[PDB]
Amino acid sequence: GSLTEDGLSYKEKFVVRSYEVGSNKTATVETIANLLQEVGCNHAQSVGFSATTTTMRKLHLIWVTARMHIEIYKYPAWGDVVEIETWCQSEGRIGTRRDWILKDSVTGEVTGRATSKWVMMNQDTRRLQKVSDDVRDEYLVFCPQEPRLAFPEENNRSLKKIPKLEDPAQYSMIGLKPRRADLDMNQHVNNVTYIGWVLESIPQEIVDTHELQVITLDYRRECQQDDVVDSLTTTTSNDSQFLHLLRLSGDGQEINRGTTLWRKK
Amino acid sequence: GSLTEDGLSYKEKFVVRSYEVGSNKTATVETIANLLQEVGCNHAQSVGFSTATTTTMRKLHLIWVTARMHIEIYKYPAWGDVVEIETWCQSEGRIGTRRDWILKDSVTGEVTGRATSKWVMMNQDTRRLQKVSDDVRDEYLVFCPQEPRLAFPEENNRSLKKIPKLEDPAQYSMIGLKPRRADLDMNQHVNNVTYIGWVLESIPQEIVDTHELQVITLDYRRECQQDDVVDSLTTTTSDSQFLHLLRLSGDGQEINRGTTLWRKK
Numbered sequence: 328g329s330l331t332e333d334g335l336s337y338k339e340k341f342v343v344r345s346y347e348v349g350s351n352k353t354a355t356v357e358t359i360a361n362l363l364q365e366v367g368c369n370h371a372q373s374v375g376f377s378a379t380t381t382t383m384r385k386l387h388l389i390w391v392t393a394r395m396h397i398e399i400y401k402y403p404a405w406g407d408v409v410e411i412e413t414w415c416q417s418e419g420r421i422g423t424r425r426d427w428i429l430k431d432s433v434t435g436e437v438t439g440r441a442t443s444k445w446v447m448m449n450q451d452t453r454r455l456q457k458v459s460d461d462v463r464d465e466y467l468v469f470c471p472q473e474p475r476l477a478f479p480e481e482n483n484r485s486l487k488k489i490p491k492l493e494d495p496a497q498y499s500m501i502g503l504k505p506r507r508a509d510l511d512m513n514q515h516v517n518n519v520t521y522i523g524w525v526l527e528s529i530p531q532e533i534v535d536t537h538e539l540q541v542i543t544l545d546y547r548r549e550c551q552q553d554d555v556v557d558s559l560t561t562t563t564s565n566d567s568q569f570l571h572l573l574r575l576s577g578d579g580q581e582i583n584r585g586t587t588l589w590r591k592k
Numbered sequence: 593g594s595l596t597e598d599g600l601s602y603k604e605k606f607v608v609r610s611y612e613v614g615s616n617k618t619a620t621v622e623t624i625a626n627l628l629q630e631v632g633c634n635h636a637q638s639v640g641f642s643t644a645t646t647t648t649m650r651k652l653h654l655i656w657v658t659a660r661m662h663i664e665i666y667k668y669p670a671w672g673d674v675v676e677i678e679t680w681c682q683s684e685g686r687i688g689t690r691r692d693w694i695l696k697d698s699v700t701g702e703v704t705g706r707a708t709s710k711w712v713m714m715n716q717d718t719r720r721l722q723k724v725s726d727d728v729r730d731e732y733l734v735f736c737p738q739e740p741r742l743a744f745p746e747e748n749n750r751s752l753k754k755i756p757k758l759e760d761p762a763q764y765s766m767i768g769l770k771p772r773r774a775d776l777d778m779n780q781h782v783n784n785v786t787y788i789g790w791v792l793e794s795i796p797q798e799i800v801d802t803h804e805l806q807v808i809t810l811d812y813r814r815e816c817q818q819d820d821v822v823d824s825l826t827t828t829t830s831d832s833q834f835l836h837l838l839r840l841s842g843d844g845q846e847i848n849r850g851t852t853l854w855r856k857k
């Protein structure tokens with residue numbers, strides 16, 4: 328991959344692997360989410376990061392995902408090449424937004440797009456804090472100055488408020504535990520695992536007859552390596568919509584909430 | 593990737609991704625196992641095996657199934673490094689075929705790991721393993737070297753050693769392991785790599801933090817269904833050596849058995 332001519336965004340091509348596809352022989356949404364993560368890490372490394380600054384490392388601060396929103400029009404087939412362009416933009420003292428565009432390497436048509444909201448947090452106390460002006464100036468130079476939104480729409484699904492699922496849930500997957508493959512290089516559960524856990528409560532009948540078009544996932548609390556999670560889903564609707572909730576198997580503490588939108592094959 | 597000059601083996605280069613590495617920022621053994629699988633699929637596709645079945649095998653409802661996997665790693669590739677893998681097949685008479693791999697450093701050319709696997713023929717409906725017929729053997733002998741080519745040539749080595757059954761009580765255990773949709777392949781079967789991850793779940797974190805996995809030999813006895821639950825058992829048999837057993841959470845039916853060998857960091 329490489330930064331674009333203006334150095335304000337990054338592009339990378341990926342060939343879809345055998346183990347990355349589903350029953351329809353096309354890449355899963357979790358594989359897509361992993362590819363978004365990979366191009367985001369490479370963009371950060373290319374502009375002198377390792378996504379902490381010296382001021383963030385000095386104050387023990389980190390970037391944490393608050394929301395992820397993915398919309399897929401066409402999933403790449405096994406063996407196809409997909410090009411992803413990614414970039415960041417400041418949103419004032421709230422935090423930063425990171426967006427992506429997925430394109431067909433042969434046709435150049437847009438086959439998917441994503442947006443995510445990130446907030447600053449103290450690594451040790453887990454206390455969120457607004458972005459200080461001194462931290463902002465350090466990365467503003469790597470972002471475009473004019474707004475550049477993967478989801479410009481006058482009123483888009485990426486910024487909709489998500490409500491809390493009411494018991495009893497219509498569908499459920501109980502006793503989900505992460506394994507070592509679910510952890511990152513810092514022994515924390517990978518943000519993609521939550522996507523897989525959310526989708527575990529969707530009935531296989533929906534999975535066999537429908538394709539996932541949209542998914543918006545709010546991140547509320549981290550799941551520890553030794554925690555157990557319950558995945559809950561309720562239908563809220565040619566198109567199927569679901570409301571999701573991830574919570575701790577025991578006390579029922581909320582870790583995630585989201586919505587998915589599926590269309591008929 | 594591409595077939596070598598003689599068309600008797602295949603090579604492919606992989607860049608190590610951010611989500612593919614462990615706590616010491618070097619690729620996991622499951623990532624290595626996935627890369628072995630990917631280069632094996634590409635080798636099969638390049639010599640005329642469509643979405644590793646032949647026209648005669650398709651006609652008779654026959655498939656290739658792994659019986660044993662043996663991986664030895666000297667140096668795990670770091671995040672961002674390129675690793676080149678060369679793979680090939682060889683017939684072993686009526687028993688079945690063997691598939692071997694050599695892992696090399698793209699910069700130095702030194703061997704950083706090597707693997708071998710034994711495959712047998714099985715009816716995909718009855719699960720009855722059969723010997724390699726004759727009309728089938730001749731159909732693929734032309735894609736394998738005629739003189740022996742072994743990733744593990746040593747006379748009386750670890751790849752061919754007999755594995756015993758773990759005796760209760762196990763010293764360590766991880767119970768209630770269930771596969772999720774990401775653990776399944778394009779045919780809704782549990783991926784052979786998931787078993788490696790499940791075996792390693794019962795290894796104490798103390799071993800994982802102080803040691804590196806050098807060797808792993810895994811026998812495949814029975815498939816784990818999408819709705820099955822597995823228990824992972826381990827006992828120290830000693831460098832550190834362990835004896836492993838995967839079995840069904842309920843009745844205690846054997847699905848896998850193996851051994852690992854770990855070196856101090």
Ligand SMILES: C[C@@H]1CCCN(C(=O)c2cscn2)CC1
Pocket residue numbers: 367370371374376378390414415423425445466469470
């Ligand atoms: C271009 C970009 C500048 C902003 C920070 N960054 C990130 O990737 C990031 C995503 S969420 C918070 N930090 C590194 C590189």
Ligand SMILES: C[C@@H]1CCCN(C(=O)c2cscn2)CC1
Pocket residue numbers: 632635636639641644656680681689690691711732735736
């Ligand atoms: C070169 C090779 C030769 C025949 C078998 N094969 C495999 O991929 C295979 C079978 S069992 C493990 N590997 C297809 C192509």
